[PDB]
Amino acid sequence: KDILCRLEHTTLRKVTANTAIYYDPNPQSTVVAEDQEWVNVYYEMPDFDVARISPWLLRVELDRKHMTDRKLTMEQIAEKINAGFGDDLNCIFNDDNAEKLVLRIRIMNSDENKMEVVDKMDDDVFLRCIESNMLTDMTL
Amino acid sequence: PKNTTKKYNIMAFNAADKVNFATWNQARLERDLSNKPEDQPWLLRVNGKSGRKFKGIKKGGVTENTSYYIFTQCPDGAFEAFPVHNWYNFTPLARHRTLTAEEAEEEWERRNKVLNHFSIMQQRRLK
Amino acid sequence: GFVGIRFCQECNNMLYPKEDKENRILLYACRNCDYQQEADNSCIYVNKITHEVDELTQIIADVSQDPTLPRTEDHPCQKCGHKEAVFFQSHSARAEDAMRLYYVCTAPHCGHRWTE
Amino acid sequence: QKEMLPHVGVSDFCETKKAYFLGYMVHRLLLAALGRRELDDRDHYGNKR
Amino acid sequence: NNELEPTPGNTLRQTFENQVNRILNDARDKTGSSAQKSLSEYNNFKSMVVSGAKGSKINISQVIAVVGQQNVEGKRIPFGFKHRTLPHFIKDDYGP
Ligand SMILES: [Zn+2]
Ligand SMILES: [Zn+2]
């Protein structure tokens, strides 16, 4: 089962259970959600520059039954989220012991390196783009 | 009183838009402007230019199905019932805004089409 | 729990989510007009993916009038101690991979519905 | 007026009827999308005349 | 009762159909074996089948036994009548 779990094209579409795109301007208090203790790791580095993360949260929840047979851990899901996209995006994930599925993607400003015309896309729409591309096309 | 030939109508609004609410002070009619001819949509206004204009198109089935008499309170001794000549529902329009009648025939959302735009870029064009 | 739309109070063209770059509070400004209003809820998009237990919902009460559905005198109604509940399966394109038999009371104006 | 949906009407005062019916078709399409109603069957003899 | 567990690699409808079809087919096979052991050496069906002329054991069954499940397109008779197979059966009737 496990050595040949490395097949079957597990895509985040069937691993996830829910999703939600939120507006959190200050992450320290996720007034939109009910998990503020996870923010305590927004204390050293969200890969850099807390002052330049976009305020749009993409809360994705991952069913644990679907995830427990493939055993594809949120550590590995995090690895793939990093690798496939890089540092343009970000992430921070709960432990598995939480029993409440959660993982959150944040879009670094992408002007974070260097800061008024027709947009690439408003970050609102562009989070509904990484909510399809990553949901169907990512190969976990 | 039947000899009198004043023909009653129906002015109906959707529960969506706010009803007259008596904030309508004085203006409630125009029936002909829709020339482009005896029967054409009404085009109504609101106490002059400033207000929320709207149009009423008639009802297909009003009399053939079942006639709708209008029994009135008639504060006098008697009561009266009038056959409704026609029914037409009013929809708020005349755009209360600017309309893009040419739009340079844009691409249908295949391009980025950053939303909340093409209407803030516009209203800046033309001052 | 997104409010599928909140139509404009002025032009009736489906308010959309916009960001207040000045004060940084969520807004719902229209596009065709210029109206803008503040936002009570901060969820702009909620796709789950899988589903919830929503077949206890989306089962209208009038189905107790169907002469083609089974009637069981066991499993009585909870809302009222009346017997004779009608029961069916999901009847949905998403079968839930289950044979959950949803019941519905057949005493008039009860309309209680429950899975067991 | 004349080609789109003739059966609901052809007169000049049936825009609302045509709108309600086209809305009902988009409603049935959305219900088939979500999954509430099942897709209709071509072999079912009630659907044949 | 939702106490049925999906056999490895199949949905619940699939394991339900598998179990009901296995029961029905074991029923037909045992019924046919009893039918074929009910025969006499002078029977002519048995003469023609143990000879080789014509007919199979399944036919000696279907004449004195159950006829068997009628499969259409590899499945039991579909719910082609809006959740029933014929207006005489009540809705959601997966029975034999
Ligand atoms: Zn508006
Ligand atoms: Zn009851």
CSV table of N, CA and C in Angstrom, one decimal, chain A residues 9-140:
chain,number,residue,atom,x,y,z
A,9,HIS,N,-1.7,9.9,-8.5
A,9,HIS,CA,-1.9,11.3,-8.8
A,9,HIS,C,-2.8,12.0,-7.7
A,10,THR,N,-2.3,11.9,-6.5
A,10,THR,CA,-3.0,12.6,-5.4
A,10,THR,C,-2.9,14.1,-5.6
A,11,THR,N,-4.0,14.8,-5.9
A,11,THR,CA,-4.0,16.2,-6.1
A,11,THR,C,-4.8,16.8,-4.9
A,12,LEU,N,-4.4,18.1,-4.6
A,12,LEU,CA,-5.0,18.7,-3.4
A,12,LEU,C,-6.5,18.8,-3.5
A,13,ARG,N,-7.1,18.6,-4.7
A,13,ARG,CA,-8.5,18.6,-4.8
A,13,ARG,C,-9.2,17.6,-3.9
A,14,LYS,N,-8.7,16.4,-3.8
A,14,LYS,CA,-9.4,15.4,-3.0
A,14,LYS,C,-8.9,15.4,-1.5
A,15,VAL,N,-7.7,15.9,-1.3
A,15,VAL,CA,-7.2,15.9,0.1
A,15,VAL,C,-7.9,17.0,0.9
A,16,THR,N,-8.2,18.2,0.2
A,16,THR,CA,-8.8,19.3,0.9
A,16,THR,C,-10.3,18.9,1.3
A,17,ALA,N,-10.8,19.5,2.3
A,17,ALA,CA,-12.2,19.4,2.7
A,17,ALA,C,-13.0,20.7,2.5
A,18,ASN,N,-12.4,21.8,2.9
A,18,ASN,CA,-13.0,23.1,2.7
A,18,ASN,C,-12.0,24.1,2.2
A,19,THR,N,-12.5,25.3,1.9
A,19,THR,CA,-11.6,26.4,1.6
A,19,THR,C,-12.3,27.7,2.0
A,20,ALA,N,-11.6,28.7,2.1
A,20,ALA,CA,-12.1,30.1,2.4
A,20,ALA,C,-11.1,31.1,2.1
A,21,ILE,N,-11.5,32.2,1.5
A,21,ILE,CA,-10.6,33.3,1.2
A,21,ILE,C,-11.1,34.5,2.2
A,22,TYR,N,-10.2,34.9,3.0
A,22,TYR,CA,-10.5,35.8,4.1
A,22,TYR,C,-9.8,37.2,3.9
A,23,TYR,N,-10.1,38.1,4.8
A,23,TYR,CA,-9.4,39.4,4.8
A,23,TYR,C,-8.9,39.6,6.3
A,24,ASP,N,-7.6,39.3,6.5
A,24,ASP,CA,-7.0,39.6,7.7
A,24,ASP,C,-5.9,40.7,7.5
A,25,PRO,N,-6.2,41.9,8.0
A,25,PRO,CA,-5.1,42.9,7.8
A,25,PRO,C,-4.0,42.8,8.8
A,26,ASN,N,-4.3,42.4,10.0
A,26,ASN,CA,-3.3,42.1,11.0
A,26,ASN,C,-3.4,40.7,11.5
A,27,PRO,N,-2.4,39.8,11.1
A,27,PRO,CA,-2.6,38.4,11.4
A,27,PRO,C,-2.6,38.1,12.9
A,28,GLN,N,-2.0,38.9,13.7
A,28,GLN,CA,-1.9,38.6,15.1
A,28,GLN,C,-3.2,38.2,15.8
A,29,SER,N,-4.3,38.7,15.3
A,29,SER,CA,-5.6,38.4,15.8
A,29,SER,C,-6.5,38.1,14.6
A,30,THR,N,-6.7,36.8,14.4
A,30,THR,CA,-7.5,36.3,13.3
A,30,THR,C,-9.0,36.4,13.6
A,31,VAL,N,-9.4,37.6,13.8
A,31,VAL,CA,-10.8,37.9,14.2
A,31,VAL,C,-11.8,37.1,13.2
A,32,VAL,N,-11.4,36.8,12.0
A,32,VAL,CA,-12.2,36.1,11.1
A,32,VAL,C,-12.3,34.6,11.5
A,33,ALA,N,-11.3,34.1,12.2
A,33,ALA,CA,-11.2,32.7,12.4
A,33,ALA,C,-11.1,32.4,13.9
A,34,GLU,N,-11.0,31.2,14.3
A,34,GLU,CA,-10.9,30.8,15.7
A,34,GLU,C,-9.6,30.0,16.0
A,35,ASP,N,-8.5,30.3,15.4
A,35,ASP,CA,-7.2,29.8,15.8
A,35,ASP,C,-6.2,30.9,15.8
A,36,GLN,N,-6.1,31.5,17.0
A,36,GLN,CA,-5.1,32.6,17.2
A,36,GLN,C,-3.8,32.1,17.7
A,37,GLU,N,-3.8,30.9,18.3
A,37,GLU,CA,-2.5,30.4,18.9
A,37,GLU,C,-1.5,30.0,17.8
A,38,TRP,N,-2.0,29.7,16.6
A,38,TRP,CA,-1.1,29.4,15.6
A,38,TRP,C,-0.3,30.6,15.2
A,39,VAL,N,-0.8,31.8,15.3
A,39,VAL,CA,-0.1,33.0,15.0
A,39,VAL,C,1.1,33.2,15.8
A,40,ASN,N,1.2,32.5,16.9
A,40,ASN,CA,2.4,32.6,17.8
A,40,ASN,C,3.7,32.1,17.0
A,41,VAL,N,3.5,31.5,15.8
A,41,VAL,CA,4.7,31.3,15.0
A,41,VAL,C,4.9,32.3,14.0
A,42,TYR,N,3.9,33.3,13.9
A,42,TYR,CA,4.2,34.5,13.2
A,42,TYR,C,5.0,35.5,14.1
A,43,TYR,N,6.1,34.9,14.7
A,43,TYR,CA,6.9,35.7,15.7
A,43,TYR,C,8.3,35.9,15.2
A,44,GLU,N,8.9,34.9,14.5
A,44,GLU,CA,10.2,35.1,14.0
A,44,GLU,C,10.2,35.6,12.5
A,45,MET,N,9.7,34.8,11.6
A,45,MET,CA,9.9,35.1,10.2
A,45,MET,C,8.8,34.3,9.3
A,46,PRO,N,7.9,35.0,8.6
A,46,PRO,CA,7.1,34.4,7.6
A,46,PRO,C,7.8,34.3,6.3
A,47,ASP,N,9.0,33.9,6.3
A,47,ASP,CA,10.1,33.8,5.3
A,47,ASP,C,10.6,35.2,5.0
A,48,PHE,N,10.0,36.3,5.4
A,48,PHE,CA,10.5,37.6,5.8
A,48,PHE,C,9.4,38.6,6.0
A,49,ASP,N,9.8,39.7,6.5
A,49,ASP,CA,9.1,41.0,6.3
A,49,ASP,C,7.6,40.9,6.5
A,50,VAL,N,7.2,40.7,7.8
A,50,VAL,CA,5.8,40.8,8.2
A,50,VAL,C,5.1,42.1,7.7
A,51,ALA,N,5.9,43.1,7.4
A,51,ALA,CA,5.3,44.4,7.0
A,51,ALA,C,4.9,44.4,5.6
A,52,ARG,N,5.3,43.4,4.8
A,52,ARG,CA,4.9,43.3,3.4
A,52,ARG,C,4.2,42.0,3.0
A,53,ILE,N,3.3,41.5,3.8
A,53,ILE,CA,2.5,40.4,3.3
A,53,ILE,C,1.1,41.0,3.0
A,54,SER,N,0.5,40.5,1.9
A,54,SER,CA,-0.8,41.0,1.5
A,54,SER,C,-1.8,40.5,2.6
A,55,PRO,N,-2.9,41.3,2.8
A,55,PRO,CA,-3.8,40.9,3.9
A,55,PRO,C,-4.9,39.9,3.6
A,56,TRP,N,-4.8,39.2,2.4
A,56,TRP,CA,-5.7,38.2,2.0
A,56,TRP,C,-5.3,36.9,2.4
A,57,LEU,N,-6.1,36.2,3.2
A,57,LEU,CA,-5.8,34.8,3.7
A,57,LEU,C,-6.6,33.9,2.8
A,58,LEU,N,-6.0,32.7,2.5
A,58,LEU,CA,-6.6,31.6,1.8
A,58,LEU,C,-6.6,30.4,2.8
A,59,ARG,N,-7.7,30.3,3.6
A,59,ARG,CA,-7.8,29.2,4.5
A,59,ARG,C,-8.2,27.9,3.8
A,60,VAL,N,-7.4,26.9,3.8
A,60,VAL,CA,-7.7,25.6,3.1
A,60,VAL,C,-7.7,24.5,4.2
A,61,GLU,N,-8.8,23.7,4.3
A,61,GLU,CA,-8.9,22.7,5.3
A,61,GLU,C,-8.8,21.3,4.6
A,62,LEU,N,-8.1,20.4,5.2
A,62,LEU,CA,-7.7,19.1,4.5
A,62,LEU,C,-8.3,17.9,5.3
A,63,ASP,N,-9.2,17.2,4.7
A,63,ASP,CA,-9.8,16.0,5.4
A,63,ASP,C,-8.7,15.1,5.8
A,64,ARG,N,-8.8,14.6,7.0
A,64,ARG,CA,-7.8,13.7,7.6
A,64,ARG,C,-8.0,12.3,7.3
A,65,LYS,N,-9.2,11.8,7.0
A,65,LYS,CA,-9.4,10.5,6.5
A,65,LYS,C,-8.8,10.3,5.2
A,66,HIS,N,-9.1,11.2,4.2
A,66,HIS,CA,-8.5,11.2,2.9
A,66,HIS,C,-7.0,11.3,3.0
A,67,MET,N,-6.5,12.0,4.0
A,67,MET,CA,-5.0,12.2,4.1
A,67,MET,C,-4.3,11.1,4.8
A,68,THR,N,-5.0,10.3,5.6
A,68,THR,CA,-4.4,9.4,6.5
A,68,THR,C,-4.0,8.1,5.8
A,69,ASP,N,-4.8,7.7,4.8
A,69,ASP,CA,-4.4,6.5,4.0
A,69,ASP,C,-3.2,6.7,3.1
A,70,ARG,N,-3.2,7.8,2.4
A,70,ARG,CA,-2.0,8.2,1.6
A,70,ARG,C,-0.9,8.6,2.5
A,71,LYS,N,-1.3,8.9,3.8
A,71,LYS,CA,-0.3,9.4,4.8
A,71,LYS,C,0.4,10.7,4.4
A,72,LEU,N,0.0,11.3,3.3
A,72,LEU,CA,0.7,12.5,2.9
A,72,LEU,C,0.6,13.6,3.9
A,73,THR,N,1.7,13.8,4.6
A,73,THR,CA,1.6,14.7,5.8
A,73,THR,C,1.6,16.2,5.4
A,74,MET,N,1.0,17.0,6.3
A,74,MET,CA,1.0,18.4,6.1
A,74,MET,C,2.4,19.0,6.0
A,75,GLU,N,3.4,18.3,6.5
A,75,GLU,CA,4.8,18.7,6.3
A,75,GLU,C,5.2,18.6,4.8
A,76,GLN,N,4.8,17.5,4.2
A,76,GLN,CA,5.1,17.3,2.8
A,76,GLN,C,4.2,18.2,1.9
A,77,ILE,N,2.9,18.3,2.3
A,77,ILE,CA,2.1,19.3,1.5
A,77,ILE,C,2.7,20.7,1.6
A,78,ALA,N,3.2,21.0,2.8
A,78,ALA,CA,3.9,22.3,2.9
A,78,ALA,C,5.2,22.3,2.0
A,79,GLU,N,5.9,21.3,1.9
A,79,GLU,CA,7.1,21.2,1.0
A,79,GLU,C,6.7,21.5,-0.4
A,80,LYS,N,5.6,20.8,-0.8
A,80,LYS,CA,5.2,21.0,-2.2
A,80,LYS,C,4.7,22.4,-2.5
A,81,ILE,N,3.9,23.0,-1.5
A,81,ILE,CA,3.5,24.3,-1.6
A,81,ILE,C,4.6,25.3,-1.8
A,82,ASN,N,5.7,25.1,-1.0
A,82,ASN,CA,6.9,25.9,-1.2
A,82,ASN,C,7.5,25.7,-2.6
A,83,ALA,N,7.9,24.4,-2.9
A,83,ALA,CA,8.7,24.1,-4.1
A,83,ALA,C,7.9,24.6,-5.4
A,84,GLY,N,6.7,24.1,-5.5
A,84,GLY,CA,6.0,24.4,-6.8
A,84,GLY,C,5.9,25.9,-7.1
A,85,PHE,N,5.8,26.7,-6.0
A,85,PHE,CA,5.5,28.1,-6.2
A,85,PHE,C,6.8,29.0,-5.8
A,86,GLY,N,7.5,28.5,-4.8
A,86,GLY,CA,8.7,29.3,-4.3
A,86,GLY,C,8.4,30.1,-3.1
A,87,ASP,N,8.9,31.3,-3.1
A,87,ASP,CA,8.7,32.2,-2.0
A,87,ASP,C,7.7,33.4,-2.4
A,88,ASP,N,7.3,33.4,-3.6
A,88,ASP,CA,6.2,34.3,-4.0
A,88,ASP,C,5.0,34.1,-3.1
A,89,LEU,N,4.7,32.9,-2.7
A,89,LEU,CA,3.6,32.5,-1.8
A,89,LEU,C,4.3,32.2,-0.4
A,90,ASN,N,3.5,31.7,0.5
A,90,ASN,CA,4.0,31.3,1.8
A,90,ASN,C,3.0,30.3,2.4
A,91,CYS,N,3.2,30.0,3.6
A,91,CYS,CA,2.3,29.0,4.3
A,91,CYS,C,2.7,28.9,5.8
A,92,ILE,N,1.8,28.4,6.6
A,92,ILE,CA,2.0,27.9,7.9
A,92,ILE,C,0.9,27.0,8.3
A,93,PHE,N,1.3,25.8,8.9
A,93,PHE,CA,0.4,24.7,9.0
A,93,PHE,C,0.4,24.3,10.5
A,94,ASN,N,-0.8,23.8,10.9
A,94,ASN,CA,-1.0,23.3,12.3
A,94,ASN,C,-0.2,22.0,12.4
A,95,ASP,N,-0.2,21.5,13.6
A,95,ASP,CA,0.1,20.1,13.8
A,95,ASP,C,-1.0,19.2,13.4
A,96,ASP,N,-0.8,17.9,13.2
A,96,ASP,CA,-1.9,17.0,12.9
A,96,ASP,C,-2.7,16.7,14.2
A,97,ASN,N,-2.1,16.9,15.4
A,97,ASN,CA,-2.8,16.7,16.6
A,97,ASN,C,-3.9,17.7,16.9
A,98,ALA,N,-4.1,18.7,16.1
A,98,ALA,CA,-5.1,19.7,16.3
A,98,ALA,C,-6.5,19.1,16.3
A,99,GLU,N,-6.7,18.1,15.5
A,99,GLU,CA,-8.0,17.5,15.2
A,99,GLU,C,-9.0,18.5,14.5
A,100,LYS,N,-8.6,19.7,14.3
A,100,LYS,CA,-9.3,20.6,13.4
A,100,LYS,C,-8.4,21.0,12.2
A,101,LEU,N,-8.7,20.4,11.1
A,101,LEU,CA,-7.9,20.6,9.8
A,101,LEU,C,-7.8,22.1,9.5
A,102,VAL,N,-6.6,22.5,9.2
A,102,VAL,CA,-6.3,23.9,8.8
A,102,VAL,C,-5.0,24.0,8.2
A,103,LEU,N,-4.8,24.9,7.2
A,103,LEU,CA,-3.6,25.4,6.6
A,103,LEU,C,-3.9,26.6,5.8
A,104,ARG,N,-3.0,27.6,5.9
A,104,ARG,CA,-3.3,28.9,5.4
A,104,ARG,C,-2.2,29.4,4.4
A,105,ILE,N,-2.6,29.9,3.3
A,105,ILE,CA,-1.6,30.4,2.3
A,105,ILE,C,-1.8,31.9,2.3
A,106,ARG,N,-0.6,32.6,2.1
A,106,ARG,CA,-0.6,34.0,2.1
A,106,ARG,C,0.3,34.5,0.9
A,107,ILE,N,-0.1,35.5,0.2
A,107,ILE,CA,0.6,36.0,-0.9
A,107,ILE,C,1.5,37.2,-0.5
A,108,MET,N,2.8,36.9,-0.5
A,108,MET,CA,3.8,37.9,-0.3
A,108,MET,C,3.6,39.0,-1.3
A,109,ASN,N,3.9,40.2,-0.9
A,109,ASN,CA,3.5,41.4,-1.7
A,109,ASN,C,3.9,41.3,-3.1
A,110,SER,N,5.1,40.6,-3.4
A,110,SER,CA,5.7,40.5,-4.7
A,110,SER,C,6.2,41.8,-5.2
A,111,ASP,N,5.9,42.9,-4.4
A,111,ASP,CA,6.6,44.1,-4.4
A,111,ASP,C,7.5,44.2,-3.1
A,112,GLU,N,7.4,43.1,-2.3
A,112,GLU,CA,8.2,43.0,-1.1
A,112,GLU,C,9.7,43.2,-1.4
A,113,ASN,N,10.2,42.8,-2.5
A,113,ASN,CA,11.5,43.2,-2.9
A,113,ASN,C,11.7,44.7,-3.2
A,114,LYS,N,10.7,45.2,-3.9
A,114,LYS,CA,10.8,46.6,-4.3
A,114,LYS,C,9.4,47.1,-4.6
A,115,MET,N,8.9,48.1,-3.8
A,115,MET,CA,7.6,48.6,-4.0
A,115,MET,C,7.5,49.5,-5.2
A,116,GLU,N,0.1,51.4,-9.6
A,116,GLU,CA,-0.9,52.5,-9.8
A,116,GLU,C,-1.5,52.4,-11.2
A,117,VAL,N,-1.1,51.4,-11.9
A,117,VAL,CA,-1.6,51.1,-13.3
A,117,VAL,C,-2.5,49.8,-13.3
A,118,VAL,N,-3.0,49.5,-14.4
A,118,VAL,CA,-3.7,48.2,-14.6
A,118,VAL,C,-3.0,47.1,-13.9
A,119,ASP,N,-3.7,46.3,-13.1
A,119,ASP,CA,-3.0,45.4,-12.2
A,119,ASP,C,-2.7,44.1,-12.9
A,120,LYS,N,-1.6,43.4,-12.4
A,120,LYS,CA,-1.5,42.0,-12.7
A,120,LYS,C,-2.8,41.3,-12.4
A,121,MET,N,-3.3,41.5,-11.2
A,121,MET,CA,-4.7,41.2,-10.8
A,121,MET,C,-4.8,41.8,-9.4
A,122,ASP,N,-6.0,42.2,-9.0
A,122,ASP,CA,-6.3,42.5,-7.6
A,122,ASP,C,-6.0,41.2,-6.8
A,123,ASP,N,-5.4,41.3,-5.7
A,123,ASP,CA,-5.0,40.1,-4.9
A,123,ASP,C,-6.3,39.3,-4.6
A,124,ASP,N,-7.4,39.9,-4.5
A,124,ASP,CA,-8.7,39.2,-4.3
A,124,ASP,C,-8.9,38.2,-5.4
A,125,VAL,N,-8.9,38.6,-6.7
A,125,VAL,CA,-9.1,37.7,-7.8
A,125,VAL,C,-7.9,36.7,-7.9
A,126,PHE,N,-6.7,37.2,-7.6
A,126,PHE,CA,-5.5,36.4,-7.8
A,126,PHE,C,-5.4,35.3,-6.7
A,127,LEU,N,-6.2,35.4,-5.7
A,127,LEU,CA,-6.3,34.3,-4.7
A,127,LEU,C,-7.3,33.3,-5.1
A,128,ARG,N,-8.3,33.7,-5.9
A,128,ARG,CA,-9.2,32.8,-6.5
A,128,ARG,C,-8.6,32.1,-7.8
A,129,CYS,N,-7.4,32.5,-8.2
A,129,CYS,CA,-6.6,31.9,-9.2
A,129,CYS,C,-5.8,30.8,-8.7
A,130,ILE,N,-5.1,31.0,-7.5
A,130,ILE,CA,-4.2,30.0,-6.9
A,130,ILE,C,-5.1,29.1,-6.1
A,131,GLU,N,-6.4,29.3,-6.1
A,131,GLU,CA,-7.4,28.4,-5.5
A,131,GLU,C,-7.9,27.4,-6.5
A,132,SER,N,-7.6,27.6,-7.8
A,132,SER,CA,-7.9,26.6,-8.8
A,132,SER,C,-6.7,25.9,-9.3
A,133,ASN,N,-5.7,26.7,-9.7
A,133,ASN,CA,-4.4,26.2,-10.2
A,133,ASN,C,-3.9,25.2,-9.2
A,134,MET,N,-3.8,25.6,-7.9
A,134,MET,CA,-3.2,24.8,-6.9
A,134,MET,C,-4.2,23.6,-6.5
A,135,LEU,N,-5.4,23.8,-6.7
A,135,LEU,CA,-6.4,22.9,-6.3
A,135,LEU,C,-6.6,21.7,-7.3
A,136,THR,N,-6.3,22.0,-8.5
A,136,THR,CA,-6.5,20.9,-9.6
A,136,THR,C,-5.2,20.5,-10.2
A,137,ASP,N,-4.2,21.5,-10.4
A,137,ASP,CA,-3.1,21.2,-11.2
A,137,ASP,C,-1.8,20.9,-10.4
A,138,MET,N,-1.8,21.2,-9.1
A,138,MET,CA,-0.6,20.8,-8.3
A,138,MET,C,-0.6,19.3,-8.2
A,139,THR,N,0.6,18.7,-8.3
A,139,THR,CA,0.8,17.3,-8.2
A,139,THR,C,1.5,17.0,-6.9
A,140,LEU,N,0.7,16.7,-5.9
A,140,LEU,CA,1.3,16.4,-4.5
A,140,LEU,C,2.1,15.1,-4.6
